[PDB]
């Protein structure tokens, strides 16, 4: 009667504690992720992107679900432009099935109201060779919406779709993928 009622109340309390604890676990996940991203950010226009499991991600681009990979955000200065990289290991557009594509992404910054627009800072991409080196560079197209002040969270990614041939990456003479790990280096001029 009433003891069984106490049992039922304990059951409800237990379920509530389970779901609440699950929500707190999700919050822990978000906090750990934000901590990692804060650790990865740089604030001087230069960013070094370390891609691991290059082979599995390549299969994850040619046939896997992920269309592209996004780097952690970085900045030209503490209160500068917010930027990130978009990478197509199996390539994008023309570059697909032949080259790997690499695009800069202007992201919505907390201080965009004080920044000049459109963004004209020269952008430089590099594929690093430990044995030692691929490189490209461009002045931003000021007539494109990619470099206007963002009206969303990010603008349209823009850069080099034919950045590097897929065949040269597999080649043994260069060490672009060493221990299933490659290094892309972005340098935004300030």
């Amino acid at each position: 009667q009433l003891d069984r009622e106490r049992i039922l109340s304990l059951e409800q309390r237990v379920v509530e504690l389970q779901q609440t604890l699950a929500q707190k676990d999700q919050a822990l996940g978000k906090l750990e992720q934000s901590l990692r991203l804060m650790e990865e950010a740089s604030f001087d226009g230069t960013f070094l992107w370390k891609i691991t499991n290059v082979t599995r991600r390549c299969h994850e681009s040619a046939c896997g679900r992920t269309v592209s990979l996004f780097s952690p955000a970085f900045y030209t200065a503490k209160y500068g432009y917010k930027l990130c990289l978009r990478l197509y290991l199996n390539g994008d557009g023309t570059g697909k099935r032949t080259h790997l594509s690499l695009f800069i992404v202007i992201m919505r910054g907390e201080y965009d109201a004080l920044l000049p627009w459109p963004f004209r800072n020269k952008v430089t991409f590099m594929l690093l060779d430990q044995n030692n080196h691929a490189i490209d560079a461009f002045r931003p197209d000021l007539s494109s919406a990619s470099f206007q002040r963002p009206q969303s969270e990010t603008n349209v990614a823009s850069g080099c779709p034919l950045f590097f041939p897929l065949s040269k990456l597999q080649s043994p003479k260069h060490a672009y993928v060493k221990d299933d790990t490659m290094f892309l280096k972005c340098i935004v001029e300030t």
């Binding site: 557009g93 800069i104 952008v123 002045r139 197209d141 494109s144 349209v156 990614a157 823009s158």
Partner: peptide, 7 residues
Amino acid sequence: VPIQCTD
């Protein structure tokens, strides 16, 4: 020439 991504 920077080229836009297909997004």
